Write an enzyme that holds these catalytic residues in place. Structure first.
Site, mmCIF file in Angstrom:
data_model
loop_
_atom_site.group_PDB
_atom_site.id
_atom_site.type_symbol
_atom_site.label_atom_id
_atom_site.label_comp_id
_atom_site.label_asym_id
_atom_site.label_seq_id
_atom_site.Cartn_x
_atom_site.Cartn_y
_atom_site.Cartn_z
ATOM 1 N N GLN B 226 1.196 -1.283 0.131
ATOM 2 C CA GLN B 226 -0.084 -0.463 0.306
ATOM 3 C C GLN B 226 1.308 1.488 -0.196
ATOM 4 O O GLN B 226 0.387 2.172 -0.480
ATOM 5 C CB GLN B 226 -0.967 0.224 0.979
ATOM 6 C CG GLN B 226 -1.678 -0.975 1.055
ATOM 7 C CD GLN B 226 -2.617 -0.585 2.500
ATOM 8 O OE1 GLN B 226 -3.179 -2.188 2.865
ATOM 9 N NE2 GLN B 226 -3.175 -0.012 3.042
ATOM 10 N N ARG B 373 -9.790 -0.588 7.350
ATOM 11 C CA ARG B 373 -10.868 0.501 7.271
ATOM 12 C C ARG B 373 -10.347 1.689 9.283
ATOM 13 O O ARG B 373 -11.735 2.135 9.227
ATOM 14 C CB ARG B 373 -12.057 0.601 7.286
ATOM 15 C CG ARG B 373 -11.842 0.211 5.486
ATOM 16 C CD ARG B 373 -13.213 -0.098 4.765
ATOM 17 N NE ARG B 373 -13.356 -1.232 3.225
ATOM 18 C CZ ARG B 373 -13.586 -0.569 2.764
ATOM 19 N NH1 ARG B 373 -14.893 0.968 2.160
ATOM 20 N NH2 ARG B 373 -14.590 -1.789 1.767
ATOM 21 N N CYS B 374 -10.123 1.127 9.958
ATOM 22 C CA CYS B 374 -9.752 1.838 11.280
ATOM 23 C C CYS B 374 -9.934 3.377 11.107
ATOM 24 O O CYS B 374 -9.691 3.771 12.190
ATOM 25 C CB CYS B 374 -8.622 1.431 11.971
ATOM 26 S SG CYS B 374 -7.357 1.897 11.562
ATOM 27 N N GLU B 749 -13.218 5.165 4.772
ATOM 28 C CA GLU B 749 -13.584 4.011 5.610
ATOM 29 C C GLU B 749 -14.250 4.361 6.808
ATOM 30 O O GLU B 749 -14.651 3.673 7.153
ATOM 31 C CB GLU B 749 -12.070 4.328 6.888
ATOM 32 C CG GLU B 749 -10.831 4.054 5.845
ATOM 33 C CD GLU B 749 -9.404 3.479 6.702
ATOM 34 O OE1 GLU B 749 -9.263 5.353 6.881
ATOM 35 O OE2 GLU B 749 -8.786 3.513 7.682
HETATM 36 N N1 LIG Z 1 -14.799 13.638 -1.546
HETATM 37 C C1 LIG Z 1 -14.302 12.107 -1.905
HETATM 38 C C2 LIG Z 1 -13.543 10.856 -1.588
HETATM 39 C C3 LIG Z 1 -13.456 9.790 -2.282
HETATM 40 N N2 LIG Z 1 -13.985 9.825 -3.405
HETATM 41 C C4 LIG Z 1 -13.020 8.879 -4.634
HETATM 42 O O1 LIG Z 1 -13.250 7.758 -2.875
HETATM 43 C C5 LIG Z 1 -12.223 7.380 -3.637
HETATM 44 C C6 LIG Z 1 -11.647 6.747 -2.028
HETATM 45 O O2 LIG Z 1 -11.182 7.808 -1.705
HETATM 46 P P1 LIG Z 1 -10.484 8.182 -0.123
HETATM 47 O O3 LIG Z 1 -11.754 7.958 0.379
HETATM 48 O O4 LIG Z 1 -9.083 9.441 -0.627
HETATM 49 O O5 LIG Z 1 -9.739 6.481 -0.258
HETATM 50 P P2 LIG Z 1 -7.909 5.871 -0.084
HETATM 51 O O6 LIG Z 1 -8.432 5.772 -1.801
HETATM 52 O O7 LIG Z 1 -7.438 6.393 0.336
HETATM 53 O O8 LIG Z 1 -8.865 4.585 0.124
HETATM 54 C C7 LIG Z 1 -8.097 3.957 1.332
HETATM 55 C C8 LIG Z 1 -9.425 3.189 2.794
HETATM 56 O O9 LIG Z 1 -10.069 2.186 1.191
HETATM 57 C C9 LIG Z 1 -10.654 1.340 1.501
HETATM 58 N N3 LIG Z 1 -11.399 1.504 0.705
HETATM 59 C C10 LIG Z 1 -10.735 0.383 -0.135
HETATM 60 N N4 LIG Z 1 -11.646 -0.166 -1.447
HETATM 61 C C11 LIG Z 1 -11.520 -1.391 -1.880
HETATM 62 N N5 LIG Z 1 -11.622 -1.872 -3.260
HETATM 63 N N6 LIG Z 1 -9.651 -2.190 -1.857
HETATM 64 C C12 LIG Z 1 -9.262 -1.541 0.055
HETATM 65 O O10 LIG Z 1 -7.967 -1.945 -0.085
HETATM 66 C C13 LIG Z 1 -9.861 -0.721 0.573
HETATM 67 N N7 LIG Z 1 -9.162 -0.453 1.607
HETATM 68 C C14 LIG Z 1 -9.893 0.417 2.806
HETATM 69 C C15 LIG Z 1 -9.219 0.771 3.655
HETATM 70 S S1 LIG Z 1 -8.173 1.112 4.902
HETATM 71 C C16 LIG Z 1 -9.138 2.288 3.087
HETATM 72 S S2 LIG Z 1 -7.471 3.366 4.532
HETATM 73 C C17 LIG Z 1 -11.465 7.313 -4.223
HETATM 74 O O11 LIG Z 1 -11.492 6.798 -5.878
HETATM 75 C C18 LIG Z 1 -11.899 8.845 -4.784
HETATM 76 O O12 LIG Z 1 -11.405 9.454 -5.626
HETATM 77 C C19 LIG Z 1 -14.768 10.819 -4.493
HETATM 78 O O13 LIG Z 1 -15.078 10.523 -5.032
HETATM 79 N N8 LIG Z 1 -15.330 12.197 -3.525
#
Ligand SMILES: Nc1ccn([C@@H]2O[C@H](COP(=O)(O)OP(=O)(O)OC[C@H]3Oc4nc5nc(N)nc(O)c5nc4C(S)=C3S)[C@@H](O)[C@H]2O)c(=O)n1
Ligand SMILES: Cc1cc2nc3c(=O)[nH]c(=O)nc-3n(C[C@H](O)[C@H](O)[C@H](O)COP(=O)(O)OP(=O)(O)OC[C@H]3O[C@@H](n4cnc5c(N)ncnc54)[C@H](O)[C@@H]3O)c2cc1C
Ligand SMILES: Cc1cc2nc3c(=O)[nH]c(=O)nc-3n(C[C@H](O)[C@H](O)[C@H](O)COP(=O)(O)OP(=O)(O)OC[C@H]3O[C@@H](n4cnc5c(N)ncnc54)[C@H](O)[C@@H]3O)c2cc1C
Ligand code: FES
Ligand code: FES
Ligand code: FES
Ligand code: FES
Lengths: 286, 795, 158, 108, 54, 160, 287
Positions: B226, B373-374, B749
């Site tokens: 990651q 997802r903590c 998360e």
């Molecule tokens: N305001 C926002 C927030 C997010 N998004 C979209 O949602 C996605 C997730 O963005 P974000 O919330 O920033 O999270 P991360 O991409 O940093 O993902 C990490 C998060 O992701 C989660 N969801 C998961 N989903 C999948 N399929 N696989 C994992 O390993 C996953 N692991 C978990 C865990 S644990 C974590 S920490 C991104 O395409 C983003 O553009 C958006 O459209 N608008």
């Protein structure tokens, strides 16, 4: 995940398979659908030297009515049992039970004979076959014989089969037209072996139970036939007092494992709740 | 207009083309010339000295190339590896084993079938030691000395070192003020809430392919990372190879869920083996090893108290946690935060004062804690407060919705300094709570519930109804350089965007997707900023040679950090394009205005240059004052975290006679500010709610008194199928982050963080009229049967 | 080693295998068809599902020797010869029925057989009909949509 | 190496992959030294200027008070007060001065 | 001593061309191949590896 | 196809080949030993030179079937097992005896044999002795120096 | 670059090779060192259906003293000729000529019999063999025979060999002890076939030439034995007027090609210059 090495055979007839199993002895195992045996080879809890695959033996597959019985070949798959509109008409409990076993992939491969022969108390068919009073036809080097399902199971992975025998067919007496039936299973999720399950078949006349038979799944180290619990239903209106009696008699014979499904006292009580619910659905069907 | 597919669009995912056709490239799909396969001999014992390892039979087996033990690693100082928590973890067990299934030797063979054979031939001689599995006993005077490598015996809490099994004590908040409040408050509401040990269980396990090229002196390491740049830096520090000669590649990853942040023994052993042998070495773990030897989640025992008035004003919160870390502290966190962001546990409420203390302890179990997802212990924080709200409400004889509404932080209070130190960015709690309550018909549910309770008391039903509420404040986007770092690297992230002469784009970021859709969504940010269609933009992550340095994907940080960097880098490109436009149009830059995909001359809108035209001009007719080309980089140090929030309602019906619970309805409102891709957000929510359902209703990893790991396979570990998983109803409000370049907060998360207390609150609420007290998770059928059994419901 | 001959995605295959080689490993390792995945070691997840002689089979729970003579379809075999995606492949993308993609080959291969078993399934039939396949990312809701989308496309073809 | 005081052996050079290398016009006309050799020096001098800003912040002096000595900035008159390029590269990640971006890179 | 040569690989699944070749000016070759193939530049991955003299 | 067994770089090799497969193509395409190169179609350049049963051979002018039973060394087989480079490989680096590297495998393989034929050659003997190997980059002067460096390393004493 | 397909044979004896070449007809070629045949197969100038490799026939390699001759097996390599102490003693012109053929790699493989049989006027050995008065031993399905090198070459790729025959050995009369010798070649670079070259063997006694023989390479569609040119040297002191007559007689029998080595007339003149220089070196060596 990785099994030990083995030699693989494809006998062409029951006779040849029995001859192989007899010659090879304890180090050979039949291979049916493989969905209990291959998983325990992958953990190396089983390490047979030889597998004797039954795939090419056509006489092991099929569903027919013979006299007052239905005779099902040992290699008939769960998927085939579900698909049989003849079985649905005669023994509709089998479809109901089979749909409660495993998942689609497993049901495409797993066989009724393997489910019966395996010896895991988690399997659902054994108690159903005890409920139905089925007989298992075995063929070996000394010829054919029959062992009641009710007499086939002694303990986890301990059964009445002898060295060099195959279970070739299951012979099931056909319940009367209009009979009630149910298989009621409590589990953690799709695919899970039962916390407890109950198989019921019963017939009614004039608002009264005439016959009843009960099997219990995975609430001891074997399937159980709840003889006394069935008997106490006969002659009753299958009302609360009768069911309370049957539940007592069924609970009394349980001896469940304490595992991820919960402790033995829970499972005993669940055997009774499954029984209650199965009898109610069977009554309605009757 | 059709082609743009920018911010706010439900853009269909570019990843799906390869994934739907089996043309993803995951680690076990990699095949290199001469590549061997490695895997471990693992401990049968939870706690024992290793007297001897006999590897001779294994080495002698045809197709076996090496069998490594700690003796081979020690000379390299690689028999221990560092952790993100500032402890070390054993790579191969040296003098002792400390958890069941711990790595003891690493066999390397022609393939995985020979390797498995050869593992069975290795003989380990053990000397049993007394096992420690109950964290409540870990600091007793006779508790076993686990970590002999770092600790001496210290049997109490008043010596010059902490107890030998005590990892850390961390406190925060105003202890004196909080104690003074609790000494005089009219109501004090106290409970011990256990957040049981669970596991992220990604569908693809942990794995890598190490290839040391001995001719070049360069290491290539494919793996399930990651945070690939962090892994590069760590592999450099420990191996002595310089970073420019370590090529870490995180390819497509089959889910991570926090399981793939840290380093594992398999990665270190594959690398050592490849260096020794000079050929590639692949390591792929099986599920039972994944579940029992890689990062667990949760395992917090939280003594949680609220002080209040009788009328329901919350005056203070006091919380002490006992944290079970297993045998090594490998808990992934920013370095200064040994309990993560557990100090968000005052939640969505305005309280004057609070205090939190956390003690971490060693036990004979696998390491981890932060995973699944903590958001760095926010799951635990939110569970603490949202359960405490409900138990307080019970004690006050108040409706818990009303209790929340009386205590919410109000919109005008933002940015809000909470009493444990975090400053929440923005929030409109009363509006979201109202929208949620109105959608589910909350007051009518309560009347329905009251009537059903009366019916139960009359013998007319065996079902009971619970209404679960979870109103939560998340904290995501780690984080400011002042206080957020991973092993000394500040927790920024980054984007580099390069525009080609003909107007398409390559962009790379310092994060790493494991399914969250980055390859689709980062391009949407750029598309809106520059007016370039999203399909004309390529996004890449995970190759440390090519991507700008970043800190990876965890803590829902991608959108807060790299999403910000993406917008800021695009705005650098836009500014340079404005100067090119000014040069072309012979005006002052100040005379220009942006209009979607072009710069126009103010009040002469006929006169304009499109972004495509400007990209070409940067190569074809570069202004002499400027450099040719059109590209930019940003490394974004966030000013603050982002604080998304949500309002979740669960209606649950429970059969008291079997313990079987069935979700009736689950409504999830999330507010993560500006929404880049509503389709992706919805999928994140569906997946996170399903996890929450699993954790609250069934999942667990357990240990018995002998230290055997129980239920660590799919025979027992509850992963719902499509039959068990509820239908999800989702909703939203939009409260932008004021400090973020596009107003976007993280969200991935949120569903798990909020969802677990929502489910658990529903179950607890169902039984509240029967005075069950706090029911500890998971709420599977046997456990709920026991609740009822103990209340006399069955006779 | 045993000599086997079979068909995979319409092409003849011949190989020499150890009897203990699991079908999933023969497919991924010897045949280099790496779409099919391994997600577990106890036959629960279905990530390894292939279509074999008209059946959905978990290929981690069969030996390659048992597939001698069989006709197998893996995810690589689902697109048409001109490259056009199958209705299922297209529906999983349109409905956002995948995230990490790791279950997706298996889910599509199971669903291919599901819609032959029942071309017009209800949602309860879909959920039950995919009970052998685990997904960690999606929460299943969009997978149901994907299958329903595919059914509508298939049912419009003729 | 000469511009930044980082040994040549600690530097990896690549060319020829159009996805990764910055756009250029190629090698012919004996142009590589005149064009990309110039760009290399100019990009390295951008990194040096940022490193000087980091040094001044860390040493609590003005940039004008610093002098370069092969591989480090020393304080004029106080040579015992210095930061090496290696130290400054770590600082750019570990303790970025509040007005600067993290990291240490450049393009020309 | 090494003559002119290439390996072209159109990935029809992804719609992306990779082109290994004996190119003194690989970016120029990319932009030329884009103009004559109609594939966009971010989908054309030109790679000039080691070249045996030009 | 014909069945052949031989030794390459000290390892046994067994293969099936068409009679017309050039040895260079068997080495590059079937054995994946891609150090040996093809620079011409008329047998002049020597980029394909390998050491074969104690001879320097242009492997583009031999069929793989002709090498049945032979012992072949290619450039991959020159470095020691401990990683250290042969005298020749080191001298080529030290003396800047290569640029593009295309002729280098064949130059080193020819030179390996040259120095067994004549362990202390004069400059004129070196030049004549590599007359079957073309280089486009170096103008040969530094190649002569590389070979002198290697000879002096092997001999423990310099000559010219 | 790529030859057409063929079947490959490895006969174990001369007799088996001859039988195979006789059976398979002109679709079969003998394969010796392959350094003229394989290059022309690669350009598909030659498309034999069979190659009859002579490598397992140990009898075909060797250098033997027999009677008043040296007998050299047809599969003896140029490298072996150079390395022979015995040849260096008795026929030193062979080493000198071989070191002007091709390059080290080619000399490891190319054989004397393939050089002599090939029929390319660019080969050096033919005219040396005519200078020396060598005899070629041929074995065919009809048995053994001998053809003088002076009678073996009729045109470019047109020799006296018949279907089914192999050239098995070259029989060279050993020249007198103390004889002079030289092979002088003009070429564009290492490995190039001669613009012109001359082979000379002569003897001297008391300031006078007693015997002389001259061969000329690559200045006609065959090698040439410059019979009259050598004869006119006999009895003279081998000074510039004697050489003028020899040169005239040599040039007169040339008929060179015009190719990248220059025009015919240039090549005829170079034959004369090479002759002068070879005679001068041979005179100095004569002994
Ligand atoms: N305001 C926002 C927030 C997010 N998004 C979209 O949602 C996605 C997730 O963005 P974000 O919330 O920033 O999270 P991360 O991409 O940093 O993902 C990490 C998060 O992701 C989660 N969801 C998961 N989903 C999948 N399929 N696989 C994992 O390993 C996953 N692991 C978990 C865990 S644990 C974590 S920490 C991104 O395409 C983003 O553009 C958006 O459209 N608008
Ligand atoms: C994930 C999963 C979930 C499952 N869930 C359930 C469930 O809910 N309920 C349930 O009942 N089952 C369940 N099963 C087990 C499944 O039904 C198996 O198919 C069954 O237990 C064995 O039948 P088989 O044909 O696969 O036999 P095999 O695995 O081939 O053989 C099982 C044993 O029986 C022996 N045997 C087989 N056939 C014969 C024969 N004719 N005569 C003598 N010996 C024979 C074998 O030698 C072996 O010892 C599940 C399996 C999996 C992998
Ligand atoms: C780059 C290069 C430069 C060269 N420079 C020169 C040069 O300066 N001077 C020079 O003289 N040569 C030169 N050669 C040619 C070289 O000497 C060849 O080795 C020679 O011409 C043929 O000998 P071989 O053994 O290689 O025969 P092959 O190539 O095997 O055979 C050549 C021909 O002779 C026939 N043949 C071979 N042996 C027999 C036999 N015993 N009986 C009957 N027929 C037979 C074959 O069937 C074929 O038709 C050069 C070659 C190359 C590749
Ligand atoms: S890999 Fe999980 S069922 Fe096959
Ligand atoms: S898409 Fe990730 S496991 Fe299903
Ligand atoms: S490739 Fe030129 S001599 Fe072999
Ligand atoms: S180093 Fe380039 S051809 Fe010799």
């Amino acid at each position: 995940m990785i099994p030990g090495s083995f030699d693989y055979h494809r006998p062409k007839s029951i006779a040849d398979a029995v001859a192989l199993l007899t010659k090879l002895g304890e180090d050979a195992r039949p291979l049916a659908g493989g969905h209990s045996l291959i998983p325990i080879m992958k953990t190396r809890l089983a390490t047979p030297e030889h597998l004797v695959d039954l795939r090419d033996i056509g006489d092991l597959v099929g569903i027919r009515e013979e006299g007052t019985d239905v005779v099902i070949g040992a290699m008939t798959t769960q998927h085939a049992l579900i698909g049989s509109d003849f079985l649905a008409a005669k023994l509709p409990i089998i479809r109901e039970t089979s749909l409660l076993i495993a998942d689609p992939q497993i049901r495409y491969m797993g066989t009724i004979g393997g489910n019966a022969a395996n010896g895991d108390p988690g399997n659902d068919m054994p108690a159903l076959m005890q409920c139905l009073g089925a007989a298992y036809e075995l063929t070996g080097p000394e010829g054919a014989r029959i062992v009641a399902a009710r007499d086939y199971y002694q303990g986890a992975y301990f059964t009445a089969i002898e060295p060099g025998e195959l279970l070739t067919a299951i012979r099931i007496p056909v319940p009367p037209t209009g009979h009630g039936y149910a298989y009621e299973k409590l589990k953690r999720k799709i695919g899970d072996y039962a916390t407890a399950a109950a198989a019921v078949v019963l017939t009614m006349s004039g608002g009264k139970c005439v016959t009843a038979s009960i099997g219990l799944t995975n609430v001891a180290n074997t399937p159980l036939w709840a003889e006394e619990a069935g008997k106490v239903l006969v002659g009753t209106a299958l009302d609360k007092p009768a069911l309370d009696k049957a539940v007592a008699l069924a609970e009394a014979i349980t001896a469940p494992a304490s595992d991820g499904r919960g402790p033995a006292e829970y499972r005993t009580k669940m055997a009774g709740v499954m029984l209650r619910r199965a009898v109610e659905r069977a009554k309605a069907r009757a | 207009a059709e082609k743009l597919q920018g911010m706010g669009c439900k853009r269909k995912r570019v990843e799906d083309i390869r994934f739907t056709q089996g043309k993803g490239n995951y680690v076990d799909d990699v095949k290199l010339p001469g590549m061997l396969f490695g895997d471990f001999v693992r401990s049968s014992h939870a706690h024992a000295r290793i007297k001897s390892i006999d590897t001779s039979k294994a080495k002698a087996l045809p197709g076996v190339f090496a069998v490594l033990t700690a003796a081979d690693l020690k000379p390299l100082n690689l028999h221990y590896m560092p952790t993100l928590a500032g402890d070390v973890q054993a790579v191969l067990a040296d003098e002792k084993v400390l958890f069941q299934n711990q790595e003891v030797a690493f066999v390397v063979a022609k393939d995985r079938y020979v390797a498995a054979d050869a593992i069975e031939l290795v003989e380990v001689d053990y000397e049993p030691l007394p096992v420690l599995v109950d964290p409540f006993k870990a600091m007793e005077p006779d508790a076993p000395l686990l970590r002999e490598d770092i600790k001496d015996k210290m049997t109490g809490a008043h010596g010059a070192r902490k107890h030998h099994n005590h990892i850390f004590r961390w406190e925060i908040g105003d202890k004196e003020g909080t104690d003074a409040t609790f000494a005089k408050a009219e109501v004090v509401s106290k409970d011990m809430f256990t957040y049981h040990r669970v596991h992220p269980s990604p569908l693809e396990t942990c794995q890598c392919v190490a290839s040391m090229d001995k001719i070049k002196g360069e290491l290539t390491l494919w793996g399930t990372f990651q945070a690939p740049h962090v892994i590069r830096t760590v592999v450099s520090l420990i191996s002595g190879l310089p970073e420019h000669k370590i090529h870490v590649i995180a390819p497509d990853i089959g889910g991570g869920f926090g399981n793939k942040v840290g380093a594992y023994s398999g990665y270190v052993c594959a690398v050592v083996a490849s260096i020794v042998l000079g050929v590639p070495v692949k390591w792929v773990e099986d599920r039972m090893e994944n579940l029992s030897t890689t990062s667990f989640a949760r395992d917090y025992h939280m003594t949680t108290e609220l002080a209040a008035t009788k009328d329901g004003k919350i005056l203070a919160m006091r919380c002490h946690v006992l944290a079970d870390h297993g045998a090594f502290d490998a808990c992934a966190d920013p370095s200064k935060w040994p309990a993560g962001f557990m100090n968000i546990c005052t939640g969505s409420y305005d309280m004057p004062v609070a205090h939190l203390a956390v003690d971490g302890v060693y036990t004979n179990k696998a390491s981890g804690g932060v995973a699944y997802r903590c958001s760095f212990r926010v799951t635990e924080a939110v569970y603490a407060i949202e359960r405490a709200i409900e138990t307080l409400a019970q004690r006050l004889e108040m409706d818990s919705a009303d209790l929340r509404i009386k205590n919410f932080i109000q919109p005008e209070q933002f940015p809000y300094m909470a009493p444990l130190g975090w400053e929440y960015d923005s929030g409109n709690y009363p509006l979201a709570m109202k929208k949620a309550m109105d959608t589910v018909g909350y007051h009518q549910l309560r009347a329905e519930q009251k009537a059903k309770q009366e019916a139960f008391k009359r013998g007319e039903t065996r079902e009971i109804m619970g209404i679960g509420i979870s109103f939560f404040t998340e904290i995501v986007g780690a984080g400011p350089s002042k206080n957020c770092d991973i092993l000394g690297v500040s927790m920024f992230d980054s984007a580099e965007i390069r525009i080609h002469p003909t107007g398409s784009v390559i962009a790379r970021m310092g994060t790493k997707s494991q399914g969250q859709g980055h390859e689709t969504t980062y391009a949407q940010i750029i598309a809106t900023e520059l007016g370039i269609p999203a399909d004309d933009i390529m996004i890449e992550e995970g190759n440390t040679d090519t991507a700008p340095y970043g800190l990876g994907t965890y803590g829902s940080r991608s959108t807060p950090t790299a999403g910000a960097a993406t917008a800021v880098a695009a705005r650098k490109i836009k500014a340079k394009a404005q100067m090119i436009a000014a040069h072309m149009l012979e005006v002052h830059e100040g005379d220009l205005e942006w209009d979607v995909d072009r710069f126009r001359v103010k009040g002469l809108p006929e006169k304009f240059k499109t972004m495509k035209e400007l990209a070409w001009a940067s190569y074809n007719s570069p202004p002499p004052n400027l450099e040719p080309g059109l590209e930019a980089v940003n490394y974004y140090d966030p000013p603050n975290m982002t604080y998304p929030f949500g309002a979740y309602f669960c209606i649950m019906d429970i059969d008291v006679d079997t313990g079987v619970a069935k979700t009736r309805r689950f409504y999830a409102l999330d507010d993560c500010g500006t929404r880049i891709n509503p389709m992706i957000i919805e999928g994140q929510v569906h997946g996170g709610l399903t996890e929450a359902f699993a954790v609250a209703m069934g999942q667990e990893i357990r240990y018995d008194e002998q230290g055997n790991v129980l239920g660590a396979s799919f025979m027992d570990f509850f992963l719902p199928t499509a039959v068990e998983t509820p239908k999800w109803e989702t909703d939203y409000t939009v409260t932008p982050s004021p400090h973020h370049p596009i107003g976007a907060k993280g969200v991935g998360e949120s569903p798990h963080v909020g969802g677990v207390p929502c489910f658990s609150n529903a179950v607890n609420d169902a039984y509240a009229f029967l005075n069950a007290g706090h029911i500890q998770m998971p709420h599977d059928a046997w456990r709920l049967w026991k609740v009822g059994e103990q209340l006399g419901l069955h006779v | 080693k045993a000599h086997i001959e079979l068909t995979i995605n319409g092409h003849p295959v011949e190989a020499l295998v150890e009897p203990r080689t699991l079908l999933i490993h023969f497919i991924r390792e010897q045949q280099n068809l790496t779409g099919a995945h391994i997600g577990c070691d106890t036959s629960h997840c279905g990530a390894c599902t292939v279509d074999l002689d008209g059946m959905s089979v978990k290929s981690c729970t069969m030996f390659a020797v048992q597939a001698n003579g069989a006709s197998i379809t893996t995810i690589e075999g689902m697109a048409a010869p001109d490259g056009t995606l199958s209705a299922l492949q297209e529906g999983f993308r349109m409905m956002h029925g995948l995230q990490c993609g790791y279950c997706t080959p298996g889910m599509i291969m199971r669903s291919h057989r599901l819609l032959q078993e029942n071309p017009s399934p209800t949602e309860a039939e879909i959920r039950f009909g995919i009970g052998g396949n685990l997904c960690r990312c999606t929460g299943y809701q969009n997978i149901v949509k994907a299958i329903q989308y595919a059914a509508a496309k298939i049912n419009g073809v003729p």
